[PDB]
Amino acid sequence: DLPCLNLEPPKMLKLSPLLRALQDRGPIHRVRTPAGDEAWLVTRHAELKQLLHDERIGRTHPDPPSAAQYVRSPFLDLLISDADAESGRRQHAETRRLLTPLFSARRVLEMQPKVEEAADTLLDAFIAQGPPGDLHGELTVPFALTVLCEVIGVPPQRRAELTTLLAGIAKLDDREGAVRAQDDLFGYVAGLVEHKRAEPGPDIISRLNDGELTEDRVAHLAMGLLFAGLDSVASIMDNGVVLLAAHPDQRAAALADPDVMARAVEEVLRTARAGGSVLPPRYASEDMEFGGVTIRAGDLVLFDLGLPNFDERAFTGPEEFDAARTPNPHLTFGHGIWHCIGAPLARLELRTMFTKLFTRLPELRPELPVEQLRLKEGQLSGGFAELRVVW
Ligand SMILES: C[C@@H]1C/C=C/C=C/C=C/C=C/[C@H](O[C@@H]2O[C@H](C)[C@@H](O)[C@H](N)[C@@H]2O)C[C@@H]2O[C@](O)(C[C@@H](O)C/C=C/C=C/C(=O)O1)C[C@H](O)[C@H]2C(=O)O
Numbered sequence: 001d002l003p004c005l006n007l008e009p010p011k012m013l014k015l016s017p018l019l020r021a022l023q024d025r026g027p028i029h030r031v032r033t034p035a036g037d038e039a040w041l042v043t044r045h046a047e048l049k050q051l052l053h054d055e056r057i058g059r060t061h062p063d064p065p066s067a068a069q070y071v072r073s074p075f076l077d078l079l080i081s082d083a084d085a086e087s088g089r090r091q092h093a094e095t096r097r098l099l100t101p102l103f104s105a106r107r108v109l110e111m112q113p114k115v116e117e118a119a120d121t122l123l124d125a126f127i128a129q130g131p132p133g134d135l136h137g138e139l140t141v142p143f144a145l146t147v148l149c150e151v152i153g154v155p156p157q158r159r160a161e162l163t164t165l166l167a168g169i170a171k172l173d174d175r176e177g178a179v180r181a182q183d184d185l186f187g188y189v190a191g192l193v194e195h196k197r198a199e200p201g202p203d204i205i206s207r208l209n210d211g212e213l214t215e216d217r218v219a220h221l222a223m224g225l226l227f228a229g230l231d232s233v234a235s236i237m238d239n240g241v242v243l244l245a246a247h248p249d250q251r252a253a254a255l256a257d258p259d260v261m262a263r264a265v266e267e268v269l270r271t272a273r274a275g276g277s278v279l280p281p282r283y284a285s286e287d288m289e290f291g292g293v294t295i296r297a298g299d300l301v302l303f304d305l306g307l308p309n310f311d312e313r314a315f316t317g318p319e320e321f322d323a324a325r326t327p328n329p330h331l332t333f334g335h336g337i338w339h340c341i342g343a344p345l346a347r348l349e350l351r352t353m354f355t356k357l358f359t360r361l362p363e364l365r366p367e368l369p370v371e372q373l374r375l376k377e378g379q380l381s382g383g384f385a386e387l388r389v390v391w
């Protein structure tokens with residue numbers, strides 16, 4: 001009898017009864033996943049943060065095609081190899097050395113004008129169209145994609161076509177459709193990488209080509225970035241709009257002052273999804289005794305960021321949306337060597353759009369009561385199916 005996890009959408013600002021019960025009853029539990037496999041679930045902020053620094057947990061497994069999974073995704077399968085634990089950790093460290101400088105404070109400051117231009121253009125169009133409008137499909141997804149394309153070096157005309165492909169690679173209910181979407185996207189990206197070698201621009205693909213990587217790895221890094229920076233930004237943005245609409249005093253504080261806005265963006269990150277934010281699978285590379293249990297070599301270890309983010313051991317009043325919360329040690333961008341390398345751009349995108357959205361549309365709010373918002377099914381990182389708003 002292992003507790004069995006599900007894919008039900010979370011409620012606003014509150015862990016589900018199963019997740020609250022597991023967090024109350026200890027820091028780590030053997031569970032069953034939506035795919036039907038067994039896993040460890042870590043439920044508290046201190047212990048999760050401690051596993052994020054434990055080099056026994058990583059993206060290697062002796063036998064990747066029989067490894068326990070949370071959901072079945074040919075995209076996530078690309079992440080796991082049968083390299084030994086040291087060689088995997090080496091691969092990963094090299095990856096971080098190359099991606100980390102692409103988002104330096106200087107480079108992020110240089111990105112700002114185009115992030116702000118893109119938000120203006122899209123918000124003009126959204127507003128021209130008049131209420132009600134699908135915030136998700138017509139604003140947050142296209143803004144995150146536009147920004148990402150500009151930074152990575154994908155031409156803007158490709159935006160409609162990537163929206164389709166990046167949805168395709170994330171299908172959970174259609175293995176062949178997902179493999180095919182992956183082949184097509186990769187074929188496009190690999191063509192783009194080759195173009196850029198002949199004609200470099202101030203963009204990530206060129207910066208990665210200026211180094212010692214194979215064509216193949218440059219393409220894989222670019223494709224991973226395109227998937228990592230799209231629906232994540234949209235999810236945090238969609239939920240921040242819901243939360244900020246629902247908390248008028250908090251919103252007013254945020255818009256009144258750019259330092260409350262910077263704090264408010266961290267509180268949106270902490271509270272956007274109260275559960276269900278389960279990261280790509282990681283595995284123990286050897287047995288380890290942790291949190292009163294013995295994790296075995298090969299066991300799946302799951303990180304659901306809602307759990308630590310709502311842990312009352314780490315946060316005073318974790319169910320309260322406090323736009324001024326400081327400090328705010330949320331784990332929404334991960335930590336340690338599993339830490340978001342795009343976080344500086346994501347934060348810029350969030351401050352930029354929250355500010356413009358609520359400045360221009362002070363009364364912006366979802367049309368439906370929150371409990372009637374519908375989540376996309378059968379899609380990795382799927383977020384809302386639509387987010388109709390009025391103003
Ligand atoms: C080069 C590689 C390639 C990319 C792999 C991407 C994995 C994405 C996982 C998203 C998972 C999750 O998606 C979920 O999938 C379930 C099936 C659904 O039933 C849920 N409805 C939800 O859509 C968690 C999401 O996470 C977020 O979006 C953050 C999420 O990027 C963090 C993952 C970073 C991965 C980096 C990485 O390896 O770089 C916020 C989002 O707020 C969070 C969330 O939605 O709760």
Ligand code: HEM
Pocket residue numbers: 095096099148224225228229230232233236279280331332333334335337338339340341342343345346347
């Ligand atoms: C607010 C939106 C975002 C959120 C919530 C988020 C969150 C995360 C998290 C939790 C991780 C750790 C994943 C893991 O350990 O499995 C991660 C890693 C990563 N993120 Fe983000 N991210 C966001 C936006 C972005 C953007 C805009 C980019 C790129 C332009 C990006 C690029 C990456 C990459 C390349 C990694 C893997 C880094 C590594 O291999 O260690 N992310 N992100």
